[PDB]
Amino acid sequence: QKLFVDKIREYRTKRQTSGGPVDAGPEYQQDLDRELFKLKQMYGKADMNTFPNFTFEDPKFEAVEKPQS
Template identity: 55%
Template sequence: MILHQILRLSSIFRSAISIQLRRNIGFSAIVFNKTKELDPVQKLFLDKIREYNTKSKQAGGPVDAGPEFQKDMNESLARLQRAYGEGDLTKFPEFKFEEPNFEETPK
């Protein structure tokens, strides 16, 4: 009986310790990735993404998009509006459901 309780308590402690170690290992991996220096290719890639992000925010849309791209984009939006009901495509549609009328039949 006592041996059974000791084994049960040891399994509880073992699971608690393993969860704590798992958390610490996961946290230390995140900290290690943030503190380690990026290799030059990764750094260049991230710099280009950040540069594109700032350019697109300044331009208010796609960067280096010519008139042909704008024309295609406007045609696609017009086609979508025709297909999905002339509404604003940037908002989630509002659905209106009618309550069903149930009739009770006498028994």
């Protein structure tokens, strides 16, 4: 369990990292940006803080001349 305790210590040290998910990873920023761009492209254009408002109209059937008794 002592090896497991050492693993727990390493996990705790990673937890206390002030930079959080930095890990000294130069490609972490690039990978995160690529993932975000892919997610945005898949979901399409959107706004982080906005509401959906729209209006529409429907024209009924136009009158057609028809004479009869």
